[PDB]
Each structure stands twice: as C-alpha cells, then as structure tokens.
Amino acid sequence: NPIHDRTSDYHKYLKVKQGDSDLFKLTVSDKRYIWYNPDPKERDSYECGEIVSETSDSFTFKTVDQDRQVKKDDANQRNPIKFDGVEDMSELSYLNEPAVFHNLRVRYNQDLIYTYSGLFLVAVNPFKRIPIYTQEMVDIFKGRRRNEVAPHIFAISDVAYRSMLDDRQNQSLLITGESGAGKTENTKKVIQYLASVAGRVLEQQILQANPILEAFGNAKTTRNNNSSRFGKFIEIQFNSAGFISGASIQSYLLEKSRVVFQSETERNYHIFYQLLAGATAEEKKALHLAGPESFNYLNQSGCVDIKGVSDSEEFKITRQAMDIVGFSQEEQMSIFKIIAGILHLGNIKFEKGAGEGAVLKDKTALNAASTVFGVNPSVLEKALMEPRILAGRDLVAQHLNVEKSSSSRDALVKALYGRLFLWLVKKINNVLCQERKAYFIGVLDISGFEIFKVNSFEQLCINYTNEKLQQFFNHHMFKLEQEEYLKEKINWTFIDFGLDSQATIDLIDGRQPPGILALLDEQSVFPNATDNTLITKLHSHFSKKNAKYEEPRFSKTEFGVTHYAGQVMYEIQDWLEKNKDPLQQDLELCFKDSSDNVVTKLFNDPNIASRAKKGANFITVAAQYKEQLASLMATLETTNPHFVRCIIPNNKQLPAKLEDKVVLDQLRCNGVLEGIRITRKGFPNRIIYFVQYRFGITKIFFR
Ligand SMILES: Nc1ncnc2c1ncn2[C@@H]1O[C@H](COP(=O)(O)OP(=O)(O)O)[C@@H](O)[C@H]1O
Ligand SMILES: Cc1ccc2c(c1)N=C1N(c3ccccc3)CC[C@@]1(O)C2=O
Ligand code: VO4
Ligand SMILES: [Mg+2]
Numbered sequence: 001n002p003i004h005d006r007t008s009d010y011h012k013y014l015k016v017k018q019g020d021s022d023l024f025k026l027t028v029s030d031k032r033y034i035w036y037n038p039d040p041k042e043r044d045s046y047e048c049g050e051i052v053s054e055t056s057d058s059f060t061f062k063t064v065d066q067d068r069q070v071k072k073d074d075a076n077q078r079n080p081i082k083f084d085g086v087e088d089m090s091e092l093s094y095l096n097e098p099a100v101f102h103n104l105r106v107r108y109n110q111d112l113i114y115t116y117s118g119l120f121l122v123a124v125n126p127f128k129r130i131p132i133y134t135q136e137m138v139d140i141f142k143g144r145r146r147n148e149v150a151p152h153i154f155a156i157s158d159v160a161y162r163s164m165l166d167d168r169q170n171q172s173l174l175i176t177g178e179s180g181a182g183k184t185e186n187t188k189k190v191i192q193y194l195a196s197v198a199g200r201v202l203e204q205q206i207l208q209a210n211p212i213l214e215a216f217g218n219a220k221t222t223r224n225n226n227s228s229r230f231g232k233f234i235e236i237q238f239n240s241a242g243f244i245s246g247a248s249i250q251s252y253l254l255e256k257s258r259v260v261f262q263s264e265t266e267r268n269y270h271i272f273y274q275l276l277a278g279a280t281a282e283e284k285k286a287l288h289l290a291g292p293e294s295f296n297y298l299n300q301s302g303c304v305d306i307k308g309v310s311d312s313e314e315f316k317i318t319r320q321a322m323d324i325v326g327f328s329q330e331e332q333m334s335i336f337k338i339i340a341g342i343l344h345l346g347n348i349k350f351e352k353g354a355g356e357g358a359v360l361k362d363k364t365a366l367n368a369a370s371t372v373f374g375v376n377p378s379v380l381e382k383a384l385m386e387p388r389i390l391a392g393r394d395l396v397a398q399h400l401n402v403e404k405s406s407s408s409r410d411a412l413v414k415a416l417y418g419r420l421f422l423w424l425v426k427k428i429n430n431v432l433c434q435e436r437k438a439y440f441i442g443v444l445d446i447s448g449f450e451i452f453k454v455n456s457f458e459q460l461c462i463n464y465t466n467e468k469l470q471q472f473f474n475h476h477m478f479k480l481e482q483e484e485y486l487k488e489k490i491n492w493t494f495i496d497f498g499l500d501s502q503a504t505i506d507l508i509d510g511r512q513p514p515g516i517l518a519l520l521d522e523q524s525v526f527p528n529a530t531d532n533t534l535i536t537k538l539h540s541h542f543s544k545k546n547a548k549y550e551e552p553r554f555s556k557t558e559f560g561v562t563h564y565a566g567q568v569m570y571e572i573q574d575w576l577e578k579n580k581d582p583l584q585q586d587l588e589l590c591f592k593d594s595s596d597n598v599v600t601k602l603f604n605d606p607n608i609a610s611r612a613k614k615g616a617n618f619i620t621v622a623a624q625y626k627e628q629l630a631s632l633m634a635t636l637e638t639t640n641p642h643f644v645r646c647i648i649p650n651n652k653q654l655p656a657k658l659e660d661k662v663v664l665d666q667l668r669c670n671g672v673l674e675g676i677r678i679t680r681k682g683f684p685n686r687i688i689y690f691v692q693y694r695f696g697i698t699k700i701f702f703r
C-alpha cells in the first residue's frame with residue numbers, strides 16, 4: 001500500500017518529508033513565538049519573534065534584528081511547529097493570517113500545492129510540473145475518503161463522485177481564482193479523474209474536447225500565457241449505475257474583441273499562431289498565408305511567440321484532437337479557411353476617396369479573403385463601405401468613411417470568430433452528449449478576476465462573474481449555514497463574517513435603483529447616446545452615492561468599482577458599441593451566399609446566427625450575459641457545491657516564489673480564514689431525528 005510506504009512516488013510528492021533530529025529538538029522546544037511586522041506600514045511582511053515575557057494582557061518578544069510589546073488581543077501567535085505542513089488547517093491552534101500563510105508556505109516550499117482549509121481545498125499554483133497526476137496517482141485516490149489520503153484535486157473529485165452515488169444528487173466543483181491562479185489546469189484534472197474512475201472512446205473524446213477549445217478560446221495575456229478568454233461549465237454525465245454516459249459544455253461569452261485588437265506583449269488566440277506555424281506547404285499557398293508579422297491582427301502587440309511553446313507542435317495537437325472528436329477533413333479545412341480569411345480581412349486597408357466615403361485602392365487582401373471564404377469580393381466590398389439600411393422605410397445605401405468601414409470590417413471578423421467558436425462547441429457537444437444523463441458532476445471554469453492598465457466592458461463582465469462566484473461561496477459557507485442554525489433553534493449567536501459582495505453586485509446589476517448594466521442598456525437604445533453621455537449618466541446615479549462606486553478626479557472617461565478582489569477603473573470608450581454588438585445586414589447577406597458549408601452554417605443556422613429581440617431592438621450583450629449568468633446560477637443552486645480556491649503565488653508566472661502580499665490579499669478576499677472559522681465554531685452535520693454536539697427543533701447537529 002503506497003499510502004504507507006515512505007518510498008512511494010505518493011510519499012515523495014504528496015506527503016510532508018520526515019524531519020530530522022535537529023528539527024525534533026526544535027519541535028519539543030518550550031519556547032513560544034509570535035508573527036509580527038518589522039515595518040507596521042507593511043502589514044503583510046512578517047517575521048517570527050521569540051516571546052520573552054508576558055503580563056496579564058501583553059507579550060514581549062525579540063525582533064529578528066530589539067524587543068517589542070503587543071497586546072495579547074492583537075497578537076498573531078505562531079503555531080507550535082509540529083503544525084507546520086499540516087494537511088488541514090482547521091487543525092491549527094492559532095487561526096490568524098500569518099499562521100495560515102506560513103502553513104501554505106511550508107507545504108509549497110516542498111511542492112505540496114494542495115492543502116485543506118476546513119471543508120474546501122486550497123491549490124497554490126506551482127508554475128512548474130509536479131508528478132502527481134499519473135494513473136498510479138489516480139488509482140491511489142480511487143475510493144478514498146478525504147481523511148484517508150493527502151490533499152489533492154483527485155480527492156475532492158472522488159468525494160463529489162461518492163456523494164453523487166450515495167445521495168442521488170448532482171454535484172458541482174466550483175474552482176475559484178484570479179487570472180493565472182490554476183483554475184483551468186485543475187478543471188482538466190477533475191475531468192481526467194472522473195473519466196478514469198467512472199469510465200467504460202467516449203472518455204478520450206471528453207479529454208480531447210479541451211485542446212480544441214483552448215486553441216480557439218485561450219490567448220496570452222499579461223497575466224497568463226494560457227488565459228481562458230471564455231468561461232465554461234462542463235457537465236460530466238453519469239448513468240443510473242454511475243458510469244460516465246457523456247459530457248456537455250456550456251460556454252459563456254468569448255472575448256471577441258481580442259481577434260481584432262491586442263495590448264502590448266499579449267497575443268491573439270493561439271490558433272492563429274498555430275496555423276501560420278504548423279501549416280503544410282500547400283495549406284499556406286491555398287490559404288495565401290505568410291508570417292504573423294504580415295497580418296495587422298498579429299503584428300500590433302509585438303509578441304508572436306510564447307516562451308516554452310511550439311505553435312507548430314501545438315497545431316499538430318489541435319488537428320489530432322479534431323480528428324479524434326470527429327471533425328471531418330473538409331470541416332477542418334473549412335475552419336482554417338475561416339481563420340485565414342479573418343487574417344486577410346484584417347489586412348484590408350480603407351482610404352478616403354474623393355469625398356468623405358472610403359475606397360479600396362488595393363484589393364489583394366479583399367480578394368484573398370473572398371477566395372478562402374467563398375464569397376463574391378465585389379459584393380463584400382459593397383457590403384463594407386456602402387452597406388444598405390432603412391431610413392424610415394426607404395432603402396438607403398450608406399457610404400462609410402475609413403473609420404466606420406474599418407470598424408464594420410472588425411464587426412464581421414468578430415462575428416465570424418464568435419460564431420465559429422459556438423459552432424465548435426455545438427459540434428463537440430453533439431459527439432459527447434449522445435445519451436440522456438441520470439446524474440451530473442458539473443465543473444465550473446470561468447475567466448478569473450483580472451486587472452490591466454486598461455479595463456473595458458469585457459473586464460467588467462468577467463469581474464462581476466467572479467464577484468457572483470465569491471458571493472455563492474459566502475452564501476453556502478456562512479449565510480445558508482447560519483440560517484439552518486436559526487430555523488432549528490440550536491442556541492447559536494449569529495456571527496457577522498463581514499464578507500458581503502451584495503453592494504457591488506447591486507451596483508453592477510441592480511434593476512431598481514438601476515445598476516451600471518441597466519443604465520448601459522438604457523443608453524444603448526437611446527438614439528443620441530454617446531460614450532460621454534453614458535459616463536455622465538453613470539456618475540449622475542452613483543458618484544458620491546454608492547459606496548462601491550468612484551468617479552475619478554484624474555479622468556473624465558473612467559469609473560471605479562470596488563470588487564471583493566479590489567478596485568478596478570473601467571474605461572467607457574466603445575461601451576455602447578460593444579453592448580449593441582452591431583453587424584451590417586449586407587455583410588450577413590454576402591456570407592449567407594458562401595460556397596463553404598461551414599461558413600454557410602454560421603450565417604444560416606439560427607441557433608448560431610439568429611439574435612433575439614427586446615421589442616424594437618436586438619438583445620444587448622449585457623442582457624445576454626445577464627441571462628447566461630442567471631441560468632448558470634440556477635443550475636448551481638440545483639447542485640451540491642464543492643469549492644477549490646486556486647491561489648496564484650506571484651504576478652510573474654514564476655515557480656518557487658511566494659509573494660507575501662499577493663497571496664495574503666487572495667486569502668483575505670477569498671474568505672479562507674472565515675471559512676476555517678465557520679468550520680471550527682459551527683455544526684457541520686444534521687439528521688432529521690437518525691432513528692461538542694447539539695439538539696435542534698427537528699435535527700441532531702454534531703461536529
Ligand atoms: N497544478 C499545476 N501544475 C503545473 N502547472 C500549473 C498548475 N496550475 C497552473 N499551472 C501553470 O499556470 C498556468 C496558468 O494556469 P491556468 O489553469 O491556465 O490559469 P487560470 O486560473 O487562469 O485558468 C498554466 O498554463 C500552467 O503553466
Ligand atoms: C455568465 C458568464 C459566465 C462566465 C463568463 C461570462 C458570462 N462572460 C465572459 N466574458 C465576456 C466577454 C465579452 C463580453 C462579455 C463577457 C469572457 C469570459 C466569459 O465567457 C466568462 O468567464
Ligand atoms: O487567465 V484565466 O482567464 O484562464 O482566469
Ligand atoms: Mg483558464
């Protein structure tokens with residue numbers, strides 16, 4: 001049994017290493033210690049100080065360099081060192097910030113990235129490979145109760161699986177994290193694990209669904225070299241017996257803006273670099289390809305390469321995964337034609353003509369896009385610069401200037417990309433979801449909280465989703481928990497855990513008084529609205545009125561929102577246009593007549609191409625996002641949730657480099673210590689009368 005053999009790969013990579021005789025001596029010491037701040041302005045940088053004397057209400061300790069006193073009430077006592085490395089931190093004697101951090105630190109220094117913290121798992125990103133995800137590792141966790149094995153993503157997954165089986169109840173794994181923290185890597189482990197322990201070709205297809213979604217849906221940001229730019233809820237579907245019967249992927253709004261624009265040092269989606277890198281000699285000639293530096297959509301950020309990544313080799317892994325799921329050879333080529341055409345569309349250069357209206361002098365990029373899409377270039381050209389609209393009921397051909405033409409070209413590119421992405425997901429689900437499910441384990445992998453120099457509408461919706469996901473943790477752990485104690489009069493004084501995202505949530509998504517998204521919608525159907533009347537309207541409603549809103553003094557085009565994870569300043573530029581998400585009907589008409597059968601489905605299949613109305617207007621992006629999110633949340637409420645808090649070590653994507661302030665800000669805003677205290681102070685279990693423990697109106701409550 002590897003669990004008991006100190007020689008195993010399991011003992012090597014998952015367990016605290018045996019201390020020595022020197023450590024033994026330190027462990028049996030009578031001395032007592034305190035975590036303190038050498039600099040009191042820097043509350044997150046701590047040293048250990050020996051307690052030298054005490055009074056009834058103070059400790060005096062030595063500082064690493066002097067002697068200092070501290071009220072016993074303000075003291076952060078160091079745990080007896082036998083606790084250093086402990087697997088579940090609810091066992092700690094002293095529950096305080098530097099103690100909890102120190103325990104994570106001890107484990108991380110040995111590459112022990114998983115630690116329990118009461119009921120939920122904490123995962124600190126290694127930023128390097130650790131050999132803990134093998135079949136042998138999987139075989140080990142299969143069937144093991146949480147206290148029989150070391151903290152692992154596998155173990156939380158097994159527990160959800162047995163809860164599903166024994167309780168006849170759908171489960172979810174809610175994996176939290178700021179951008180780069182590990183959500184997506186852990187999601188893949190949950191999937192690997194569920195597929196192995198409950199498996200019977202379907203399994204390999206479930207696994208191969210990921211590299212396709214990542215190629216088209218992930219990109220290098222300044223925070224994450226593999227940033228998920230769409231969120232997903234993955235259902236792992238089980239028959240009544242308890243074997244995997246399939247899976248189903250719900251994807252949430254993709255960041256389509258990245259196709260046409262990237263910040264300095266970022267990349268477009270991986271797939272663009274992979275085609276250019278790994279295409280055959282005849283792919284490149286048939287598609288009219290060249291190098292990234294040749295394409296406006298690839299040559300603006302100054303980064304075409306990611307360190308440690310071969311795009312050509314990733315291209316091969318994307319084609320392999322596409323073969324295995326079932327994309328036919330003509331389908332794959334069609335996919336790449338669309339990729340290529342988008343790049344050609346990016347190279348169209350509009351110029352001013354005699355009048356205000358744009359012209360196309362050089363038609364090379366236009367002709368190459370039209371060739372690979374299989375559309376008529378003279379029709380596409382007309383649709384870009386001279387699209388037809390109704391003025392009343394009259395049919396009036398516009399003549400768009402350079403800016404408007406360029407922006408219409410962008411809209412068509414983003415619609416092609418977003419519709420292709422939804423098509424990929426549709427196709428994948430048709431393969432993976434071939435039987436009705438009896439049960440599911442859902443795994444949630446969203447875009448994590450993020451802040452850049454410039455935050456826009458996309459960041460607001462991401463950060464709001466992360467805020468709602470934190471509220472859902474607060475709700476389970478603290479609010480629902482205590483309401484049970486109340487409806488069961490169990491002698492429980494209510495505790496205010498002071499973690500409440502409601503005010504920020506209401507500010508963003510309130511309907512009465514209207515929140516930010518509601519005001520955005522109003523402005524969006526208002527014919528005279530500009531990004532300036534929008535910001536004005538926002539400041540008018542919230543400035544000096546909402547405690548989570550700030551009108552900045554240094555800018556007339558930004559507003560700040562105080563999120564659980566910190567303040568973000570949002571730039572209002574283009575919000576009305578992003579929210580309306582327009583595309584000229586004449587572009588849709590042009591692409592409806594495509595000779596390509598994939599292109600044709602993107603424009604004629606109403607489940608991909610159709611857009612809902614709200615009275616006389618198409619549904620806004622904010623209204624769609626709101627719908628997806630409420631639908632997500634209602635699904636979760638039907639499940640028993642399991643929480644994994646992923647935690648980023650630093651903001652440099654480096655191994656072996658825990659940054660104090662980075663990690664502790666996460667522990668605070670995640671409510672990790674509060675989560676440990678409800679575990680300790682409260683009453684985990686209760687059974688209807690069944691036929692340091694307590695008797696309720698209808699239930700015995702224990703510990
Ligand atoms: N358990 C892990 N083992 C090895 N590397 C990891 C692990 N978790 C995260 N990483 C690394 O950190 C990067 C960011 O992780 P990822 O899961 O993509 O972030 P996010 O939270 O943004 O989904 C990964 O591409 C990988 O380099
Ligand atoms: C409900 C719900 C859940 C999860 C998400 C979501 C929405 N939206 C997201 N993003 C978005 C992009 C452009 C505009 C608006 C939103 C991009 C990431 C995103 O897919 C996400 O993690
Ligand atoms: O960088 V992550 O968007 O996948 O949170
Ligand atoms: Mg991710």
Ligand SMILES: [Mg+2]
Nearest residue numbers: 453555558569
């Ligand atoms: Mg600024």
